[PDB]
Scaffold this motif. Sequence first.
Motif, PDB file in Angstrom:
ATOM      1  N   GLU A 221       0.846  -1.185   0.000  1.00 55.09           N
ATOM      2  CA  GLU A 221       0.000   0.000   0.000  1.00 55.09           C
ATOM      3  C   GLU A 221       0.883   1.237   0.000  1.00 55.09           C
TER       4      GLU A 221
ATOM      5  N   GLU B 258      -0.318   1.639 -10.331  1.00 54.86           N
ATOM      6  CA  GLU B 258      -0.772   0.428  -9.655  1.00 54.86           C
ATOM      7  C   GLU B 258      -0.551  -0.806 -10.517  1.00 54.86           C
TER       8      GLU B 258
ATOM      9  N   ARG C 106      -1.701  -1.016  -4.354  1.00 52.67           N
ATOM     10  CA  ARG C 106      -2.791  -0.061  -4.264  1.00 52.67           C
ATOM     11  C   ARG C 106      -2.232   1.268  -3.785  1.00 52.67           C
TER      12      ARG C 106
END
Lengths: 101, 154, 138, 196, 132, 131, 100
Positions: E83, E105, E117
């Motif tokens: 992330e 991404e 993400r």
Amino acid sequence: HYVDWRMWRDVKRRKMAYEYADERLRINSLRKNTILPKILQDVADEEIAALPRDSCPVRIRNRCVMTSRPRGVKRRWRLSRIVFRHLADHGQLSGIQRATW
Amino acid sequence: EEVVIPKKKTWDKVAVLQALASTVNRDTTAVPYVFQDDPYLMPASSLESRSFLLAKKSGENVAKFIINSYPKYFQKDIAEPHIPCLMPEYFEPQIKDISEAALKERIELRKVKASVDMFDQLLQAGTTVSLETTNSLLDLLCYYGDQEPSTDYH
Amino acid sequence: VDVPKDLTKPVVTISDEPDILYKRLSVLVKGHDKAVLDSYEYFAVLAAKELGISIKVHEPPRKIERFTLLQSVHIYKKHRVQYEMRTLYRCLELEHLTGSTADVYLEYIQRNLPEGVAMEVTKTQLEQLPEHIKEPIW
Amino acid sequence: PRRKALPPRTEKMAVDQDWPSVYPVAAPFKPSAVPLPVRMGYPVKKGVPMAKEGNLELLKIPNFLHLTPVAIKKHCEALKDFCTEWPAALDSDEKCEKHFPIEIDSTDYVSSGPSVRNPRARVVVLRVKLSSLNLDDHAKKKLIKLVGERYCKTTDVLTIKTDRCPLRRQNYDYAVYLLTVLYHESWNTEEWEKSK
Amino acid sequence: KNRAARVRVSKGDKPVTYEEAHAPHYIAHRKGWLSLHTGNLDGEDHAAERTVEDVFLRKFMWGTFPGCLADQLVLKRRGNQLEICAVVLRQLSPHKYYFLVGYSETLLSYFYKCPVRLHLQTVPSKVVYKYL
Amino acid sequence: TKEAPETDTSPSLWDVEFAKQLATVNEQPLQNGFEELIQWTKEGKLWEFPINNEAGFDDDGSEFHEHIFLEKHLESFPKQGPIRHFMELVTCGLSKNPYLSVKQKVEHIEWFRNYFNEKKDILKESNIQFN
Amino acid sequence: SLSEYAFRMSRLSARLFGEVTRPTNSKSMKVVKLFSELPLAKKKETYDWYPNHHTYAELMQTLRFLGLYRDEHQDFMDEQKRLKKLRGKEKPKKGEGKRA
Ligand SMILES: [Mg+2]
Ligand SMILES: [Mg+2]
């Protein structure tokens, strides 16, 4: 596109040592024993010494992967003391902090 | 003495996730998940809602274009277990020889122009062509109408 | 006013084979932050009580790994910098589980394992003596 | 003119809402979604901690907003259909070792990264007391001499640790096989044993 | 004198951020860590590969979002996921942000073989902790 | 209906493209976070929990007796002598190695068998009859 | 310095646990350690010590020509290399250099 030629020469050494790793392993087994005849052990001493120099693992050097520095390298991160501190001092290395006690 | 051991329960790898998703409902204060949860990036109008997903879908196509045009950069696989869905696709034929198996490989890639131009060469040579192979070429031609499928870029 | 009139639940079929037993389930989580472990403990303990599981919690002693490096790029040996990585532990000892119950609880807490937190799950299974061990052949 | 940002949706939220629907899973801190005047940071002289808007310190935190007590109790209510009941018979540990005298240990490691492999997961340990085995005086005396330092006389437990083979199912089989050849050889009597 | 990760005082007209205003001896007292993973924990492995991925990501995002990043990144790893949490400015158009979110991404998922993400938080102007 | 259709026959292009139109009616964007995880897990991008360190790694369906008992491959060697003692040490270490496969452990052994076939003349001077 | 019964018993335990049976000296026991472990050269920390700088440098060179990555460092040295042509400090032709 590596840092320098010194780095590039070590990349080749690590590649040639990975191809002959098994061949060198099988031959050394014959030499490292007192069971087989001396005549056979003498032939294996010449077969492994006729292999290319760069295939020997002792000729490999753990350089920094960012600066190609041969000394002052931490094996766990594969970085030099100067690059390690640059990332640790900016808080970019998880868990790494300065020690006080 | 005998202890009764219970029977084992089984389920699918996504069963525990479907049970947790059944415990939530749509958030009325929010926009569809696909959008970025940020006031400046939230779609206000209905035109933005559609133009914001078309731009995000356009970046996925620009990346796939680059991934399939320079596969060598993305061939290194470090994942364990292997993830086949994250590896470059190869749309070009590999068997350059002219044979019966070399045409079948050009029919699985839907190469209408190459397969038909190569079918004549195979037919001109006089080599026996199976009826299950010539029937697989008609399906590729009868569907697209002797025209190439759509592609990212030519 | 808008609510799903009916809901679909994931299918859980019962198998004929017997289930596995676990005398103990030891969960050891590591981390650099203690409050993240105190918060993960509260979540894992409360999730066990709602599932009907026995759990005990204790805090093993921490480990601190230190090392020193030169302060300057050139010379000035005397002057160095010392660093440390602090590893904090938190062990969750469960007891008297089954293969299915542990499969669910572990998946629930493993997924919600926060950032910078590892886990070592030691599973103690209960077995019975094999058939060949019952009596000697000689 | 320039595009202006909409007001944060925290204002539209009600107090008696369903929070799990807002933070269903793990996600970073979104100040436009969390309706709390939470501050973070070391204040300057005659100052106050930094506000949540634009604060990087709150983004560094691995929050627990998706794991509120209300959600946990609601999540587990849906997970009771996957579980099985523990035999009421096996109340204590003394009764567990009477019907199941063998204990298999195996460890699994969860670490971040793209690879899940770990060589420490192949190890298997097998513990069993010699009082649960059908042994006689001779067999027991001989079995303790073969295993060596694997047997603890203080606890009368035989510990077999196998880490030879790549997979963990193979080492499990190896350990059971080792317990079997040990049991049978212990019963077998050889001629040299007379010269004790 | 010590120089590492210190913004030298000036007349008073230089704005700095919170992370940029605290030196290395505050990294666990008044700051946190910009990357969070398990490599550097006791008994864990692959701390060297996680570092090269971090170094590359901070540069990929600096040149992919040129002039848009307001503050350093925050990388997070939960198992297989990666992330990326960023604070960006509001000069660029949202149409161009959604393009770069889907482009980055995707490109990074095929490069590192992991689901990636990206989470943006726009601010009107670079937040200022104090003036040195 | 018919009891047994032509299951062996593979679907044609018309059948493969019509199944792609039936997967689009139910196509919708991800409505929540959980669904994203579910989609990834089905594709294979996200790990399957609970974590198994041996996921996607079965060593050619090999049993433990194929890694530990390697004296089955020593049937082309002298049953007694130095070569047996030496090759009884190679297979003892190859049995303690969890980093190799059975296909890799045999390669080592086959190499020695071929190596001793080239040194026959040298093994005669030392009074060793290898095949 | 062991009794016959203890020696013949230890030899048996070795056979069960797949250890060395024949009497072997310390020099020849290294053959067991050479094949019971993976050689240093084939370990992944050795042959994958360096990240492949070709991929990282070739990828981001391509992404810059495509307009998707902005390298502030190449732009710097590209502007300097442009000002040295106006100043006359241009790289000479290979072979046809100042020397001969
Ligand atoms: Mg050296
Ligand atoms: Mg000083």
